[PDB]
Amino acid sequence: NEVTKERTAQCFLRVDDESMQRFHNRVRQILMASGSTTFTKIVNKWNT
Amino acid sequence: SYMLPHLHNGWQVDQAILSEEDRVVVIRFGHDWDPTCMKMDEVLYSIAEKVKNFAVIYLVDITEVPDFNKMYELYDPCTVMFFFRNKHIMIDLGTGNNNKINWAMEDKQEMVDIIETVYRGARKGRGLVVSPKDYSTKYRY
Amino acid sequence: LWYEADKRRLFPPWIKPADTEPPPLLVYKWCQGINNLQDVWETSEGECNVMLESRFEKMYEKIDLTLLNRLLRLIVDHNIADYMTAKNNVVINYKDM
Amino acid sequence: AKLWDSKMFAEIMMKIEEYISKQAKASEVAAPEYRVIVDANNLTVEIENELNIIHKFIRDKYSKRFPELESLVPNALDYIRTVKELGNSLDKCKNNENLQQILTNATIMVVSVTASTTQGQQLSEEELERLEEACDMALELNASKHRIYEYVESRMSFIAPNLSIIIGASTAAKIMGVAGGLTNLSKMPACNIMLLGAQRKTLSGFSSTSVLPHTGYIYHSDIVQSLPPDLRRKAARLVAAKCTLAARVDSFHESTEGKVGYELKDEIERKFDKWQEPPPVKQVKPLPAPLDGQRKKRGGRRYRKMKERLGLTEIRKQANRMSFGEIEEDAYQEDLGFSLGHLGKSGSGRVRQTQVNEATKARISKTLQRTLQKQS
RNA sequence: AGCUUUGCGCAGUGGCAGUAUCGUAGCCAAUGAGGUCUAUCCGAGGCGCGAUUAUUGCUAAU
C-alpha cells in the first residue's frame, strides 16, 4: 500500500490453460514438422 | 484403382516386368476392393501421369494371379514391389521388411519420392536402395 | 501514424494493449493499482468490488468501412483515411478462389 | 429568380413538345415525323442546360445550412431531392424511407454522420421560397425529360434502327440524348461514348474498384450485364466500339433495315461466346527423369557472374565456422540457434573487420523495374 | 560542295542485364489491343500453347 507502506494483499500467480495449451501445440507442431529437419534445428526451436 | 492397367494371369505380370528396361515397374499386389489397397490405389492414380518418364504402374489381383503369393510373401492385404530391368529392387524402409511397402500411405509426394529414389539407385546398378523417410514410427505426436 | 499519435496524446493511458510497459509489468501495475485504492479490501458497510474481463467478440470482422472512414477523418486528414479504408477493401486470394 | 424566368420559354417549348408527342400518339395510330424527334432532342438538351444551372443555384443557396452535402452526394437530381427532403432541420434522417429511395445506405449513413457535425446555420423563410421552388421545377424538368425519354425510346425503332438493336432503345435514348444528338455522338470516339453519363460517384471509404470507376450507360446496358463481372469492362469496350460503328451508320441513315446492326450484333455475340468458351485440353507433362552422370556446360562472362553471385563471400564463409568450446551470448533473442560463428568473434579470423561484398547486393527484376518506371 | 535529320541494312568498339529470350499454317486486334491514378480521358499489341542450362552453339578439360 503505497500510501502506508504495508503488506496488505497477496497476488497468487498462475499460468492459464490457454498458454499451456498453446505451448503444447507449439511443441507438437515442432515435432510433427520434423520430416528432415536436423536434430540441432529441432532443439533450437525447442529452446526458443 | 480401376483406372490403372490391370494384369489378369501369371504370364502378363512377368512380361510387364520384362517388357521394360528404362523405367521402374511398380506393381501393387493385392485386392482393389480392399480398404487398404483402395487407399493407395488412388495415390498411385494421382501420380501415374507425373512419373510416366521413369515409372509404369500395373495392378495385380493375387486371387486372379495366385502364382507369386508363396515366393514374394503376398499375405499382407496390400503390397508394392519395384522392379528394374527384371530385377527386384530391394528398398530399406524404417520397417523390418525391406522388400515391399506392405502399408497404404496418404501423401502423393512421398510415393514419387520413393519411386524416384528407386530409379536413381537402379540406374547406378544397386540392388538395395535407401528411402529418404524413416518408417520406424508414424511421426504422429 | 504512431509517431504523430504519440507526439499528440491521441491514445489515453488506459489503452495500452502494448505500451512501454511489457505485459508482465502491465499485470504487476494493474494488480498494484487494484491494491492501491482507498478502501478496496474493506467490506464492513457491505460494499463490494466486481471485476469484468471480456473481449469485444468479432471486433475485427464487425468494422464497417464507411463508418471507419468517418471516424478516421477526425484524427487524420481525409486523404490518408480514404487510403486506409480503400486498402482494407481489397480482393483476398487463396490458392484458387 | 432569374433561372425560373429563364425556364419559362423552355417550359413553353416543353408544352409544345408535349402537344406534339400526344399528337404523335394519335397521328401514328410539311412538319415530318423526324423533325419532331430532332426538336425534342434539342429541347431535352436545353432542359438539361437549365437543370445544371438550377442545381448550381440550389447548391449555392443551401450551402449556408449544410456546406458538405454536395461533396457527399455527387449526382444532381439526387442533390435536389436530398435538399428538398432534409429541409432546414436535419433531424429527419433517422429511419427515413424516402432517403433510401435516393441514396445508397452507405451514403445515407455518411450524410447522416455529417449532419451530426454541421457548422451550417438554419435558413430563413425567404430561403424556403427559393430552394423549394427550385426543387419543384427540378422535379418538373426531370418529369419532362422522362416524358420525352419514352417518346425518343419508342421512335428509335425508326430514327436509329442500327443503334437501337445492339444496346436496346432505352439505353440508346439515354446515350443519344446526353451526347447532344446522333450527329454529335457520330463525331465522338468510342472511348468517349463509353463515358456517356459516367457518374463520378463519391467513394464511401471503399476501394475505387468497388464503386465502378469510369463506368457509363453502356456499362449499365442489358447486353454487358449478362456477362460475368470480370469480362464486363472488356465487353464494355467492344460493345461501345460496335455501338459507335452503328451510330456512324445511323447518322447518315443507311441500312435502315438493320443489316449492319445485325452484323455488328453477330460480331459482338461471337466475341462474347468466344470469351465465355471453356478452356481447352491441357496436357499434364510428367516430371523429368533423374539426371545422368555428367553433362557438358558452357562457361564465360555469364558463368563467371553466376559463380560470383553464388560464390561463398568471405563474410558468409566466416559465419559458417562456429569455433569450438567457446560459449557465446545468444544473439537475436527472438530466434536463438542463430550464431554468427567466427564473424565478429575474438576466437579467430582477420584483424580487420570482414568487409561487405557488393556482388551479393539485392537486385530487382527487369520487369519489376519496368513497373517502377511506368508507375512514376 | 559540304553540313545535317530519320528509318533500314552491314560490320567495329564498349558498357549492361541472364526471373528471360524465342517461336504463333493457335486465336483476337487501330472496324481498337489493353487500362491503377488523370477517364467526354488514354490508346498498341494481347492471349493460349510450345522450346529453355530462364536464348543457342562450338572448343576445352574431367
SS3 for D308?
A: helix
d(CA D18, CA D317): 91
Q: Do B132 and A34 touch (CB under 8 A)?
A: no
Q: Do A35 and B133 touch (CB under 8 A)?
A: yes
Q: How far is the CA of B122 from the C1' of E33 (A)?
A: 53
SS3 for B40?
A: helix
- Specify the amino acid at residue B63: T
Strands B24-30 and B55-61: parallel
Q: Are C38 and A8 in contact (CB under 8 A)?
A: no
Query: What is the DSSP-derived secondary structure letter of residue B141?
Result: -
Q: Do C35 and A9 touch (CB under 8 A)?
A: yes
Q: Do A47 and D337 touch (CB under 8 A)?
A: yes
Residue D373 CB lies within 7 Å of the nucleic strand E = no
d(CA B138, CA A31): 11
Q: How far is the CA of D246 from the C1' of E31 (A)?
A: 10
Q: How far is the CA of D371 from the C1' of E19 (A)?
A: 15
Residue D233 CB lies within 7 Å of the nucleic strand E = yes
Closest chain A residue to D336, measured at CA: A48
Q: Do B50 and D292 touch (CB under 8 A)?
A: no
- DSSP result, B41-92: TTHHHHTTTTTTTTEEEEEEETTT-TTSHHHHT--SSEEEEEESSS-B-EEE
Q: Do B50 and D286 touch (CB under 8 A)?
A: yes
CA distance B69 to chain D (A): 32
Please, which positions of strand E sit below 7 A from a protein CB?
17-21, 27-28, 31-37, 39-43, 48-51, 53, 56-62
d(CA D328, CA D342): 11
* Residues of chain A positioned with their CB less than 8 A from the CB of B140: 32
| Cα-trace Rg, chain A | 20
d(CA D215, CA D260): 26
d(CA B26, CA B122): 13
Is A29 touching D (CB cutoff 8 A)? no
- DSSP result, D111-165: HHHHHHS-------HHHHHHHHHHHHHHHHHHHHHHHHHHHHHHHHHHH-TTHHH
SS3 for B26?
A: strand
Q: Are B83 and B36 in contact (CB under 8 A)?
A: no
Return all residues near D356 (Cβ < 8 A) that are at least 6 apart: D315
C-alpha cell at C3: 509517431
Q: Do B141 and A35 touch (CB under 8 A)?
A: no
Query: What is the DSSP-derived secondary structure letter of residue D88?
Result: S
d(CA B123, CA B125): 5
Identify the CA nearest to D342 among candidates D357, D326, D358, D356.
Answer: D326
d(CA D89, CA D96): 14
Question: In the complex, which subunits touch C with 3 or more CB pairs below 8 angstroms?
Answer: A, D
Residue D182 CB lies within 7 Å of the nucleic strand E = no
Best residue in C67, C68, C70 for a mutation probing chain D (most D CBs within 10 Å): C70
C-alpha cell at D199: 457518374
* Residues of chain D positioned with their CB less than 8 A from the CB of B119: 289-290
Residue C8: burial class (beta carbons within 10 Å; 0-12, 13-18, 19+) = exposed
Is D337 touching A (CB cutoff 8 A)? yes
Residue D179 CB lies within 7 Å of the nucleic strand E = yes
Residue D242 CB lies within 7 Å of the nucleic strand E = yes
Any idea which nucleotide's C1' is nearest the CA of D189? E40
Is D210 touching C (CB cutoff 8 A)? yes
Measured over the CA atoms of residue D182, residue D187, residue D192 and residue D193, the dihedral's sign is positive
Q: Do A1 and C31 touch (CB under 8 A)?
A: no
**What technique was this entry resolved by?**
cryo-EM
- Specify the amino acid at residue A13: L
Q: Which residues 290-319 in chain D have a CB closer than 7 A to strand E?
A: 294, 296-298, 300-302, 305
- DSSP result, D2-15: HHHHHHHHHHHHHH
Is D335 touching A (CB cutoff 8 A)? yes
Q: Looking at domain B2-136, which of 3.30.70.1050, 3.40.470.10, 3.40.30.10, 3.50.50.60 is its CATH number?
A: 3.40.30.10
